[PDB]
Structure formats: C-alpha cells, structure tokens
Amino acid sequence: SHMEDFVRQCFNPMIVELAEKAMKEYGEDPKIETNKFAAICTHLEVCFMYSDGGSKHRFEIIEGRDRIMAWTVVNSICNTTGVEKPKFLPDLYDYKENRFIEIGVTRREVHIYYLEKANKIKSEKTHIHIFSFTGEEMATKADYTLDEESRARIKTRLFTIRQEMASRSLWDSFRQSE
Numbered sequence: 001s002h003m004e005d006f007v008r009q010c011f012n013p014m015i016v017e018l019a020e021k022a023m024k025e026y027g028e029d030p031k032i033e034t035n036k037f038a039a040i041c042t043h044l045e046v047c048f049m050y051s052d053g054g055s056k057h058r059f060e061i062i063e064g065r066d067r068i069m070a071w072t073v074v075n076s077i078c079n080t081t082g083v084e085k086p087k088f089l090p091d092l093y094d095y096k097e098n099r100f101i102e103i104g105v106t107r108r109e110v111h112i113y114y115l116e117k118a119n120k121i122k123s124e125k126t127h128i129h130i131f132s133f134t135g136e137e138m139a140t141k142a143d144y145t146l147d148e149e150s151r152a153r154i155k156t157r158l159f160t161i162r163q164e165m166a167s168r169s170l171w172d173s174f175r176q177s178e
C-alpha cells in the first residue's frame, strides 16, 4: 500500500510494532488503514521523545501500554499522588508538575486540535500539549513543560516525516485524512 512500506522504513521497528499492537487491540488493520497507521506511529514517536526530554524518570509513560495495563498505572498514580482520575486515557504523567499530559499531533490547524481535546476531557486538571506538522505547538496555560530544545527536536522530526510523505506523494492523502 506504499504508505505501509514507508512507515516500516521511517519509524523505529519497536514503534511500528507498538502501533500494530495498539491498532489490532481496537479492531483496526494497519494494512488497509495506512493513514491511521502513520498517525499512530507519529503519535507514539512524539510521546517517546516527549518523555525523553525530561530528567531521568520525570515522566510515567502511559501511551504504548495495553489498555488494561495503561489504566492500571493511571489508577496507581491517582491513588498515590491524589490527582483526579481522567475520563480518557492520557499519554504521560508529569511527576514534577503532578499532572497527566495529553499529547496530540495535528495535520490541520494546530489551534483547532486543542479545541477538540479540550472539549473532550472534562477533567481540566490534566495538561494538554499539541504539536503540528508545520512546526507549531500549543500547550495548556502556555506551560510547555519541556525545554525549548526538547520541543524543537519534535517539531523538526515532525517536518522531516512531512517531507518524506510528500517526496513519495502520500502527504496530501495523509493530511486530508483527519
């Protein structure tokens, strides 16, 4: 499906297997839903870079775990720190700022995606951080959590994936897909 071969050669093999394992958990096959396959791989890579931008063990990685296991660590964090349980599964937990982080990668307007995720999670205690393929970012209360250098690499990698999709003529089908 062309997009499938590009995903396997663009993303780290463990990230590709994680997106496959996550898609098959929700009854989706990455061989047909190739645009969703590239989006989950991109979201998985950004989340792993985000947690890497911290300090040693600043973040608790929620994304990439099984649906049952991810909710298990979420319950453990809520029952040890005391934060409110979120209605939807977040991506990380900031042990420094004591809040869950929700990371999104957009292809449309970066200003729009926040409006979608803000009106979804009623628990306003959890943070929200959107990255864009054009190099923009938007976080809750202007608290961008990470250092400027850590976020700049995520934007750079996001634009690199954009150029590779357009170079093989799949960016338009992937951008006009969410």
Ligand SMILES: O=C1NCCc2cccc(c2)OC/C=C/COc2cccc(c2)-c2nc1c(O)c(=O)[nH]2
Binding pocket: 022, 023, 024, 026, 028, 036, 039, 040, 043, 063, 089, 090, 091, 103, 104, 105
């Ligand atoms: O937490 C998340 N978990 C996604 C795990 C998953 C895998 C397959 C199917 C799913 C769930 O069913 C629910 C979603 C179905 C639409 O597939 C896409 C496509 C592109 C991005 C995302 C989801 C996306 N997933 C999350 C985010 O937090 C996020 O910001 N974006």
Ligand SMILES: [Mn+2]
Binding pocket: 063, 089, 090, 091
């Ligand atoms: Mn998630």
Ligand SMILES: [Mn+2]
Binding pocket: 043, 091, 102, 103, 104
């Ligand atoms: Mn997310």
